[PDB]
């Protein structure tokens, strides 16, 4: 049970910026007033996104 | 979150795994012993500094 959507117009998407996005909490460890640094999968700042 | 760390990288915070209760660290007691005494030829009285 599905309907084919053939009314979609083909067009390449535009590109925007990623100034201060992609950050998230590293783990489930509470941190207060500490400058903790770690290696993790993180979106680069000011990067190209679609 | 279940655990926590301080500025000295010590597990000073923990979460109870049975209810929404959070606990921290505040020491029961402490002590640094140091004994002040004169020479054995002079006398034998001693005193302890904490
Ligand atoms: C991202 O890349 C596309 C294609 O490489 C380009 O057209 C677009 O201008 C880029 N955007 C930025 C913000 O650099």
From Swiss-Prot, chain A:
Q: Name the reported effect of residue 6 to R.
A: In strain: Delta/B.1.617.2, Omicron/BA.2, Omicron/BA.2.12.1, Omicron/BA.2.75, Omicron/BA.4, Omicron/BA.5
Say what the protein does. Attaches the virion to the cell membrane by interacting with host receptor, initiating the infection. The major receptor is host ACE2. When S2/S2' has been cleaved, binding to the receptor triggers direct fusion at the cell membrane. When S2/S2' has not been cleaved, binding to the receptor results in internalization of the virus by endocytosis using host TFRC and GRM2 and leading to fusion of the virion membrane with the host endosomal membrane. Alternatively, may use NRP1/NRP2 and integrin as entry receptors.
From which source organism is this entry?
Severe acute respiratory syndrome coronavirus 2
Origin organism lineage:
Viruses, Riboviria, Orthornavirae, Pisuviricota, Pisoniviricetes
- Mutagenesis or variant effect for residue 6 to I: In strain: Omicron/BQ.1.1, Omicron/XBB.1.5, Omicron/EG.5.1
Q: What is this protein called?
A: Spike protein S1
Q: How does it assemble?
A: Binds to host ACE2. RBD also interacts with the N-linked glycan on 'Asn-90' of ACE2. Cleavage of S generates a polybasic C-terminal sequence on S1 that binds to host Neuropilin-1 (NRP1) and Neuropilin-2 (NRP2) receptors. Interacts with host integrin alpha-5/beta-1 (ITGA5:ITGB1) and with ACE2 in complex with integrin alpha-5/beta-1 (ITGA5:ITGB1). May interact via cytoplasmic c-terminus with M protein. May interact (via N-terminus) with host bilirubin and biliverdin, thereby preventing antibody binding to the SARS-CoV-2 spike NTD via an allosteric mechanism.
The observed outcome of changing residue 5 to F is:
In strain: Beta/B.1.351, Gamma/P.1, 19B/501Y
Q: Which residues of the full protein are shown?
A: 14 to 63 of 1273
Glycan-modified residues:
4, 48
Documented effect of changing residue 7 to N: In strain: Gamma/P.1
Quote the gene name from the UniProt entry. Answer: S
